[PDB]
Amino acid sequence: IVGGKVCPKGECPWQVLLLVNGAQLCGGTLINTIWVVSAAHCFDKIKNWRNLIAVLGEHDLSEHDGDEQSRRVAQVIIPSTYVPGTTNHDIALLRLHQPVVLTDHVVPLCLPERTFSERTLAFVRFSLVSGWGQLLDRGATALELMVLNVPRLMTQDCLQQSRSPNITEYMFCAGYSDGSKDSCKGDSGGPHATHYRGTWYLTGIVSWGQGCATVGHFGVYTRVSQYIEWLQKLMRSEPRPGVLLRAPFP
Amino acid sequence: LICVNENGGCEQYCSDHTGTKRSCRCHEGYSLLADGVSCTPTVEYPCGKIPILEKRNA
Numbered sequence: 577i578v579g580g581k582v583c584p585k586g587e588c589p590w591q592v593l594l595l596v597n598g599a600q601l602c603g604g605t606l607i608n609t610i611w612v613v614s615a616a617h618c619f620d621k622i623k624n625w626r627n628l629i630a631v632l633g634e635h636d637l638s639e640h641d642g643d644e645q646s647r648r649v650a651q652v653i654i655p656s657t658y659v660p661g662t663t664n665h666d667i668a669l670l671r672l673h674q675p676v677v678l679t680d681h682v683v684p685l686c687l688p689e690r691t692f693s694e695r696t697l698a699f700v701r702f703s704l705v706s707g708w709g710q711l712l713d714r715g716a717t718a719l720e721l722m723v724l725n726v727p728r729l730m731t732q733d734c735l736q737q738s739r740s741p742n743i744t745e746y747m748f749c750a751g752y753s754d755g756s757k758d759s760c761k762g763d764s765g766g767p768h769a770t771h772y773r774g775t776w777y778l779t780g781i782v783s784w785g786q787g788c789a790t791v792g793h794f795g796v797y798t799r800v801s802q803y804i805e806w807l808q809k810l811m812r813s814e815p816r817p818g819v820l821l822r823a824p825f826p
Numbered sequence: 827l828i829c830v831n832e833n834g835g836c837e838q839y840c841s842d843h844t845g846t847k848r849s850c851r852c853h854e855g856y857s858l859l860a861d862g863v864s865c866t867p868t869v870e871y872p873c874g875k876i877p878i879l880e881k882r883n884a
């Protein structure tokens with residue numbers, strides 16, 4: 577995250593850190609005690625599906641404070657329409673091997689209904705994006721969880737205000753074209769969270785962009801409203817052997 | 827009231843029904859108040875609420 581601030585410990589309680597062999601991979605969002613939403617592209621280069629770990633309640637990567645909860649990732653579910661090394665349909669649903677325990681520091685973000693998200697949340701101007709990604713383009717990643725308030729654009733406006741892949745109906749733009757403020761690659765998979773009347777909801781996933789906080793370019797986020805029924809159906813399904821699952825979309 | 831305008835007056839989710847009818851609903855871990863619009867938590871850790879801030883106003 578470029579141009580944000582430290583998320584005070586406990587104020588981003590849905591944030592997930594994904595690790596592979598102890599190394600930071602991506603962010604994600606807790607939506608229930610066993611389910612995490614992240615980005616499909618986080619998984620394009622995974623060799624051993626069995627060393628993926630999700631951490632909840634993380635804040636400062638330099639220390640252990642006893643609020644962290646680590647779980648193995650039992651299932652990574654990606655829509656059939658996602659093609660590795662391309663941008664569209666950039667979403668993954670992760671099943672943890674055992675539930676996390678909800679605490680002051682570990683709380684799910686609400687997965688909204690489709691209609692509510694399309695008719696109401698999509699018009700809330702500002703939303704928060706968070707992660708342990710790069711603090712600067714070509715810079716080090718953050719040790720403390722960072723958060724940034726970003727404004728959402730209508731896609732026609734994003735295209736006009738920008739100066740490369742299509743921005744599809746499964747995506748939306750948010751952020752700033754002046755190079756000051758953005759999410760960046762190490763924030764991939766993390767939440768774009770939208771407040772409405774006292775409650776926060778999942779509206780986007782950190783997905784792609786040009787460089788990092790690059791002048792002339794906004795961040796691109798997966799439009800989670802397109803996937804609500806796909807996610808809900810999968811959350812009612814039994815687990816299957818083998819970590820990766822490709823599931824039909826729609 | 828129709829759900830496309832002002833969220834139907836609902837705090838959370840809204841369904842249109844045949845007639846000038848609307849029903850609000852709440853996410854799991856919440857229940858709908860007698861106003862027909864407001865949602866109140868039913869569990870300790872409802873989704874989308876920040877415990878350290880909800881207690882900073884409790």
Ligand SMILES: CCOc1cc([C@@H](Nc2ccc3c(N)nccc3c2)C(=O)N2CCC[C@@H]2c2ccccc2)ccc1OC(C)C
Pocket residue numbers: 617618620621661662663664666741758759760761762763764782783784785786787788789790794795796
């Ligand atoms: C769908 C993801 O597609 C892409 C993803 C990315 C990058 N993630 C982001 C996320 C948010 C960004 C933002 N808000 N502002 C600025 C830049 C941002 C970069 C990423 O994850 N990369 C790049 C280096 C390796 C790793 C990767 C990328 C892809 C796959 C695996 C790992 C960059 C280009 C991509 O597509 C091109 C075509 C624009």
Ligand SMILES: [Ca+2]
Pocket residue numbers: 634635636637638639640641644
């Ligand atoms: Ca820590």
Ligand SMILES: [Cl-]
Pocket residue numbers: 812813814
């Ligand atoms: Cl099933």
Ligand SMILES: [Cl-]
Pocket residue numbers: 625818819820
């Ligand atoms: Cl496997």
Ligand SMILES: [Cl-]
Pocket residue numbers: 867868869870
């Ligand atoms: Cl309670």
